[PDB]
Design a protein around this ligand. Structure first.
Ligand SMILES: *[C@@H]1O[C@H](CO[C@H]2O[C@@H](C)[C@@H](O)[C@@H](O)[C@@H]2O)[C@@H](O[C@@H]2O[C@H](CO)[C@@H](O[C@@H]3O[C@H](CO[C@H]4O[C@H](CO)[C@@H](O)[C@H](O)[C@@H]4O)[C@@H](O)[C@H](O[C@H]4O[C@H](CO)[C@@H](O)[C@H](O)[C@@H]4O)[C@@H]3O)[C@H](O)[C@H]2NC(C)=O)[C@H](O)[C@H]1NC(C)=O
Ligand SMILES: *[C@@H]1O[C@H](CO)[C@@H](O[C@@H]2O[C@H](CO)[C@@H](O[C@@H]3O[C@H](CO)[C@@H](O)[C@H](O[C@H]4O[C@H](CO)[C@@H](O)[C@H](O)[C@@H]4O)[C@@H]3O)[C@H](O)[C@H]2NC(C)=O)[C@H](O)[C@H]1NC(C)=O
Ligand SMILES: *[C@@H]1O[C@H](CO)[C@@H](O[C@@H]2O[C@H](CO)[C@@H](O[C@@H]3O[C@H](CO)[C@@H](O)[C@H](O[C@H]4O[C@H](CO)[C@@H](O)[C@H](O)[C@@H]4O)[C@@H]3O)[C@H](O)[C@H]2NC(C)=O)[C@H](O)[C@H]1NC(C)=O
Lengths: 162, 54
């Protein structure tokens, strides 16, 4: 693609807290999170079933980056999302993905046994993005513009010069 | 059984209802299952209820 250009969209998440950060990702002195990801926790006693739709009406492809949260315990899972088994379903006209989070521990890193699985979805012009979840969703704040062209990546330690 | 001297290609499918009421209205039990196996392999698909865009 050769670009990180991010377009922030208007996703409206109701009955659910946004912006939730952690100690393992820090911005400034306080807690923080992935800048392009929105971590949603419950509000009150309830985390509602979320059904939302984001149409792509533009003439270019959209790349949405999202995630799924894996708690290291049932007490964390339920403490955050209410229902003890979460679900995330991301579908367009041409495809769908359904991920059901893995509770339990995988070996510690950065002080946490809980992780995130990252997934991407491409939305073509005239197609809509649809997002549906009962819990365990790290939502997109928008998309990345997709370009076609000569850009690439290379692994090197060589210094750069003028 | 395939008793012939040539390979057979079987095409089949799984039905995804847009509702539990359609699923149960059609198939009785609210969670369906399909398992297709030969000696050398197997596939097991459990249908996705719910809506994908019209
Ligand atoms: C990453 O880049 C995004 C896209 O912009 C650009 O990309 C970069 C790399 C460069 O190439 C730039 O030259 C290029 O423009 C940034 O998104 C931008 O964010 C700003 C600030 O929030 C948005 O400004 C607002 O635009 C509103 C509508 O604009 C219309 O036209 C644009 C431009 O083509 C379209 O994208 C839109 O869809 C609209 O059709 C406008 O109404 C707003 O005015 C109101 O708000 C201001 C306060 O911000 C207020 O003063 C005023 O009274 C109004 O109430 C506002 O101007 C801008 O739309 C948006 N650009 C795009 C292309 O989406 C993004 O910020 C950047 N990321 C970071 C973190 O820097
Ligand atoms: C299945 O087995 C695995 C391995 O035994 C287990 O996961 C492991 O959990 C332990 C802790 O229970 C992890 O060890 C950590 O190491 C860090 C780094 O130094 C420590 O800081 C951690 O200890 C903290 O908490 C302790 C208890 O209060 C304090 O004594 C300590 O000072 C710290 O505050 C912690 O011990 C270990 O890293 C993982 N295993 C792996 C391979 O990473 C898991 O819990 C077991 N699951 C079940 C179902 O029992
Ligand atoms: C999660 O959200 C999605 C999107 O909101 C939703 O799926 C959508 O269902 C609507 C209808 O409920 C679909 O829109 C259809 O568009 C056709 C084509 O023109 C209409 O003909 C359909 O309307 C018929 O039925 C209506 C109700 O009686 C009548 O008013 C109308 O005249 C027609 O008879 C229908 O509105 C839409 O296409 C999908 N979404 C997408 C992206 O395709 C889904 O139901 C939501 N799920 C949950 C759990 O709530």
């Amino acid at each position: 693609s050769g670009t990180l250009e991010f377009i922030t969209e208007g996703f409206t998440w109701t009955g659910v807290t946004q912006n939730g950060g952690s100690n393992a990702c820090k911005r400034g002195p306080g807690s923080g999170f992935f800048s392009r990801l929105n971590w949603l926790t419950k509000s009150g006693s309830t985390y509602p079933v979320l059904n939302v739709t984001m149409p792509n009406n533009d003439n270019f492809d959209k790349l949405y980056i999202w995630g799924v949260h894996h708690p290291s315990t049932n007490q964390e899972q339920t403490s955050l999302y209410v229902q003890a088994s979460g679900r995330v379903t991301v579908s367009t006209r041409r495809s769908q993905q359904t991920i059901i989070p893995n509770i339990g521990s995988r070996p510690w890193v950065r002080g946490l046994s809980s992780r995130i699985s990252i997934y991407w979805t491409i939305v073509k012009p005239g197609d809509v993005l649809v997002i549906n979840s009962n819990g365990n969703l790290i939502a997109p704040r928008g998309y990345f513009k997709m370009r076609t062209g000569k850009s690439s990546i290379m692994r090197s330690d060589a210094p750069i010069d003028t």
